[PDB]
């Protein structure tokens, strides 16, 4: 029962300290929890995607141990190797578990800028850097064999390095901490945010994946495209 993050609902599978929810035949959401100190549990979500005989991960859990539990769940439930992981910015809820991925021999990718900020944010950098074009699309040579993951840098928003990921062959796109749900009362932690550019960045994410109907985000259950539009409206007020 987290203080922040979606509550458990029908069909959620508890596995150790984590929760897994199937979103599509080949896509699952992973959820892990961190107690912030007298405030209670904060849930954070990422994705697991099956692509033929391999698995792709978006975001770590908060900690190495939680991330190792995600790999255990994949081993038990899917029993295919993880080819790579993409982390969406250099903060604990998205990159806290890097060491567990590396110990497992999984290739890790992040925005070059995330890797550059990682030491200052108390994170371990990914082993490979993604770079982006002037319109935000990933340079394909930096994202080799990404299968259905379509990586897009929408512009500075929640952080300057935040990236997003569409799942090709599905109607799902992942906004990470940039996007908050359609009924959110705030944009969350704006401590590292670009308030000037936030609204345009949120709308750019919506425009990059214009037919994604299921929007997955770090701290709420998957939502409609109203998550994008509501996030942008909140950001318009900054
Ligand atoms: C939901 C939150 C208000 S708390 C969650 C996280 N917080 C962080 O990742 C922080 N950068 C952090 C977490 C633990 C310790 C220090 C900073 N991120 C925020 C957000 O996405 O807006
Ligand atoms: Cl944050």
UniProtKB/Swiss-Prot annotation:
Keywords: Antibiotic resistance, Hydrolase, Metal-binding, Periplasm, Plasmid, Signal, Zinc. GO terms for biological process: antibiotic catabolic process; response to antibiotic. The keyword Hydrolase applies. Inhibits by captopril, thiorphan, dimercaprol and tiopronin. This enzyme is not susceptible to inactivation by the beta-lactamase-blocking agents clavulanic acid. Disulfide bonds: none annotated. InterPro entries: Metallo-B-lactamas, NDM-1-like, RibonucZ/Hydroxyglut_hydro. It catalyses: a beta-lactam + H2O = a substituted beta-amino acid. It is found in: Periplasm. Substrate binds at residues 180, 189. Its EC number is 3.5.2.6. SMART domains: Lactamase_B. It is an enzyme of class 3 (hydrolase). Zn(2+) 1 binds at residues 89, 91, 158. Its cofactor is Zn(2+). The keyword Ligase does not apply. One of its GO terms (molecular function) is beta-lactamase activity. Zn(2+) 2 binds at residues 93, 177, 219. Enterobacteriaceae carrying this gene (identified by PCR) have been isolated in Sweden, India, Pakistan, Bangladesh, England, Scotland, Northern Ireland, Australia and the USA. The organisms they were identified in were K.pneumoniae, Enterobacter cloacae, E.coli, Proteus spp, Citrobacter freundii, Morganella morganii, Providencia spp and Klebsille oxytoca. In India most isolates were from community-acquired infections rather than hospital-acquired infections, indicating the gene is widespread in the environment. Belongs to the metallo-beta-lactamase superfamily. Class-B beta-lactamase family. PANTHER family: ACYL-COENZYME A THIOESTERASE MBLAC2 (PTHR42951:SF4), METALLO-BETA-LACTAMASE DOMAIN-CONTAINING (PTHR42951). Monomer. Confers resistance to the different beta-lactams antibiotics (penicillin, cephalosporin and carbapenem) via the hydrolysis of the beta-lactam ring. Does not confer resistance to the polymixin colistin or the fluoroquinolone ciprofloxacin. This is Metallo-beta-lactamase type 2. It comes from Klebsiella pneumoniae. The lineage of its organism: Bacteria, Pseudomonadati, Pseudomonadota, Gammaproteobacteria, Enterobacterales.
């Amino acid at each position: 029962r987290p203080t922040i993050g979606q509550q458990m609902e029908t069909g959620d599978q508890r596995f150790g300290d984590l929760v897994f929810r199937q979103l599509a035949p080949n896509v699952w959401q992973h959820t892990s929890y961190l107690d912030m100190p007298g405030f209670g549990a904060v849930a954070s979500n990422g994705l697991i995607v099956r692509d033929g005989g391999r698995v792709l991960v978006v975001d770590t859990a908060w900690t190495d141990d939680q991330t190792a539990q995600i790999l255990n769940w994949i081993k038990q439930e899917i029993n295919l190797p993880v080819a790579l992981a993409v982390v969406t910015h250099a903060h604990q809820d998205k990159m806290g578990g890097m060491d567990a991925l590396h110990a497992a021999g999984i290739a890790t990718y992040a925005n070059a800028l995330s890797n550059q900020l990682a030491p200052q944010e108390g994170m371990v950098a990914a082993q490979h850097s993604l770079t982006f074009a002037a319109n935000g699309w990933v340079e394909p040579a930096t994202a080799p064999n990404f299968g259905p993951l379509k990586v897009f840098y929408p512009g500075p928003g929640h952080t300057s390095d935040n990236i997003t990921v569409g799942i090709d062959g599905t109607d799902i796109a992942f906004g990470g901490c940039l996007i908050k749900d359609s009924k959110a009362k705030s944009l969350g932690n704006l401590g590292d945010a670009d308030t000037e550019h936030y609204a345009a960045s949120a709308r750019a994410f919506g425009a990059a994946f214009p037919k994604a109907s299921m929007i997955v985000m770090s701290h709420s259950a998957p939502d409609s495209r109203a998550a994008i539009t509501h996030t942008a409206r909140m950001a318009d007020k900054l």
